[PDB]
Amino acid sequence: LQPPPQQLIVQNKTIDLPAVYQLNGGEEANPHAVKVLKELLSGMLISIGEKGDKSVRKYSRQIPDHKEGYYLSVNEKEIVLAGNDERGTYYALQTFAQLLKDGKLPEVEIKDYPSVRYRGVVEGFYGTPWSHQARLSQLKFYGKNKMNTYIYGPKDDPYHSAPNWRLPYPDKEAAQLQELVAVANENEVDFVWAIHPGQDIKWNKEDRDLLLAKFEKMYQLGVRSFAVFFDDISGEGTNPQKQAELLNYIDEKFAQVKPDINQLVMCPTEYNKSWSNPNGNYLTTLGDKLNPSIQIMWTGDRVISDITRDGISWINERIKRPAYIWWNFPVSDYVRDHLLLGPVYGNDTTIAKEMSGFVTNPMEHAESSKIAIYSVASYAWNPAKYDTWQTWKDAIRTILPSAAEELECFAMHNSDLGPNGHGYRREESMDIQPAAERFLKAFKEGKNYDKADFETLQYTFERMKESADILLMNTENKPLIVEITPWVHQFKLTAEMGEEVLKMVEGRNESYFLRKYNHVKALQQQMFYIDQTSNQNPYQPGVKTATRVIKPLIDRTFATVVKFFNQKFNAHLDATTD
Ligand SMILES: CCCC(=O)N[C@H]1/C(=N/OC(=O)Nc2ccccc2)O[C@H](CO)[C@@H](O)[C@@H]1O
Numbered sequence: 287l288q289p290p291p292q293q294l295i296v297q298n299k300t301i302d303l304p305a306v307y308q309l310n311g312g313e314e315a316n317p318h319a320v321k322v323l324k325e326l327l328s329g330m331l332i333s334i335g336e337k338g339d340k341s342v343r344k345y346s347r348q349i350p351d352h353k354e355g356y357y358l359s360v361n362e363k364e365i366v367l368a369g370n371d372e373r374g375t376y377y378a379l380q381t382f383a384q385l386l387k388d389g390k391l392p393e394v395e396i397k398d399y400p401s402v403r404y405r406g407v408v409e410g411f412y413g414t415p416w417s418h419q420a421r422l423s424q425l426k427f428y429g430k431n432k433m434n435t436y437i438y439g440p441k442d443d444p445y446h447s448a449p450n451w452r453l454p455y456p457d458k459e460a461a462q463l464q465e466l467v468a469v470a471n472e473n474e475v476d477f478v479w480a481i482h483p484g485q486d487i488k489w490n491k492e493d494r495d496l497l498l499a500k501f502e503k504m505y506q507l508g509v510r511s512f513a514v515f516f517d518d519i520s521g522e523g524t525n526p527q528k529q530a531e532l533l534n535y536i537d538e539k540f541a542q543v544k545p546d547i548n549q550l551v552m553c554p555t556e557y558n559k560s561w562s563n564p565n566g567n568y569l570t571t572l573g574d575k576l577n578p579s580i581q582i583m584w585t586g587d588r589v590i591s592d593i594t595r596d597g598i599s600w601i602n603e604r605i606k607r608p609a610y611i612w613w614n615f616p617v618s619d620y621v622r623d624h625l626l627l628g629p630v631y632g633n634d635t636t637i638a639k640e641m642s643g644f645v646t647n648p649m650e651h652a653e654s655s656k657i658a659i660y661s662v663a664s665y666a667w668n669p670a671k672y673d674t675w676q677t678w679k680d681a682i683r684t685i686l687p688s689a690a691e692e693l694e695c696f697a698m699h700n701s702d703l704g705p706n707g708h709g710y711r712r713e714e715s716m717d718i719q720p721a722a723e724r725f726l727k728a729f730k731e732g733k734n735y736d737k738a739d740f741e742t743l744q745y746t747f748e749r750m751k752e753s754a755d756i757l758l759m760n761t762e763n764k765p766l767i768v769e770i771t772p773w774v775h776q777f778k779l780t781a782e783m784g785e786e787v788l789k790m791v792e793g794r795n796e797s798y799f800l801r802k803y804n805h806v807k808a809l810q811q812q813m814f815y816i817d818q819t820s821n822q823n824p825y826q827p828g829v830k831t832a833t834r835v836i837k838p839l840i841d842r843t844f845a846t847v848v849k850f851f852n853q854k855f856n857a858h859l860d861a862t863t864d
Pocket residue numbers: 410411412517553557583584585589612614617619620647
């Protein structure tokens with residue numbers, strides 16, 4: 287079960303999904319939840335509803351008193367799916383669908399609710415914006431994983447940024463947004479429309495209600511949640527009193543005047559500790575003057591950082607509310623030549639009460655981002671039960687059941703950022719790291735390497751090639767495969783290089799060695815070709831893979847083995863990989 291319930295009792299028996307059922311509550315439970323339920327089955331009583339519905343009266347003491355909470359029960363005589371509110375019943379069904387395997391249900395009893403109020407994704411990365419279809423797919427994935435939040439803002443959409451923010455959406459674009467909003471609604475996600483006025487806004491009555499008027503227009507289109515960004519604001523616009531006053535005005539005239547506005551969030555100009563002036567008074571001012579119903583976004587101690595108890599105390603003390611965390615992972619828009627497919631880890635698991643929200647900023651690779659996104663959904667719903675490694679594997683098995691082992695193999699070796707401008711790193715290839723390290727230490731001093739570590743490495747390379755070739759031809763998730771194809775090609779080429787280098791280590795004779803050596807040089811050059819021709823971008827063009835442990839192991843083994851050959855046969859073979 288992902289995310290894992292707050293409370294779960296499994297009774298060790300298993301019942302059949304009823305051949306014949308009595309559906310009680312179908313006309314008064316959340317229609318989004320009923321829709322899912324009716325999809326799941328084509329007599330035994332099944333009761334669906336929210337606290338206060340007639341249909342769930344019997345079980346209202348079992349329904350948790352938390353927003354988005356629910357009670358779920360399965361046993362011999364009946365099935366209960368009962369939310370504390372509408373979204374909660376929908377969340378009951380997302381768990382129910384995960385329990386239902388081969389027409390059979392386990393006998394269980396669940397009491398569940400989220401530890402973090404707002405959970406989901408911010409579309410805030412640089413690079414090729416996601417397509418329309420990518421976003422419809424993301425929205426459905428958020429619903430399944432009980433993420434309640436999507437902060438919109440594609441960079442090819444000019445009507446949320448300076449200067450066309452003042453201007454309303456054109457007809458054809460409007461209807462597309464409208465489709466996003468509708469799909470979000472259906473999946474119980476708050477479509478949060480973010481405005482980015484900072485670049486060209488003035489503190490005067492005119493810009494003041496061009497914003498209001500814009501929000502109203504967005505309201506007519508179905509938008510029920512809103513964000514305002516000040517990260518990019520300049521000059522007098524960095525005044526926290528002026529910012530507070532604008533947002534409070536938006537709160538007073540709009541958020542509190544409308545019946546059904548959910549989220550209202552702002553991004554401050556000081557959005558991490560290291561970009562905060564110690565002598566200034568930006569955040570305390572903002573925290574004193576901003577209405578209490580308005581969230582303040584925060585990335586932690588640095589632009590890229592994992593959230594700690596000290597970090598969250600330091601900010602919460604100043605804005606006088608629990609920070610709304612923006613986590614800059616797996617976003618790779620500053621290491622564009624890397625894919626970040628590793629586990630999600632580093633965030634403190636005891637600090638749920640200290641955060642109002644937790645949203646991840648993903649990659650420009652929408653589908654490849656689902657691994658971290660699923661993990662974040664799991665962390666933010668139940669941090670205290672959060673299992674990094676198990677959640678990673680579940681995500682992979684969920685995203686690509688037909689080739690889960692292959693995707694795991696691939697992702698294990700595509701997780702580190704490599705060295706970069708934020709100094710942010712992730713672990714990679716941990717499984718084979720000790721075998722690598724030993725081999726490298728031993729071999730380098732003509733002191734025998736272990737046969738078992740040689741075999742581990744051989745085994746790895748063989749497995750990488752199989753994984754790579756299976757992944758290329760996989761048709762269960764074509765969008766995913768299209769995103770990762772350049773890296774998969776490069777990852778395969780890496781595996782081949784490693785195999786040929788290991789045949790150089792086992793050097794049989796002079797002729798065979800030179801054959802292997804020429805093949806490695808040719809393979810290097812194919813890697814360079816892909817790096818010069820795929821994923822070209824002004825910032826970090828190209829395709830890097832297996833960069834933490836595996837490629838340095840291969841480069842060094844190659845450099846070393848060529849050195850020994852130059853010594854033994856008086857040759858001058860090039861020993862570089864550069
Ligand atoms: C509240 C978060 C704001 C944020 O994260 N902004 C950008 C962001 N900014 O990072 C910077 O280093 N920005 C910056 C640095 C110097 C001067 C101005 C901005 O980091 C992310 C990762 O690359 C980008 O995807 C974001 O769009």
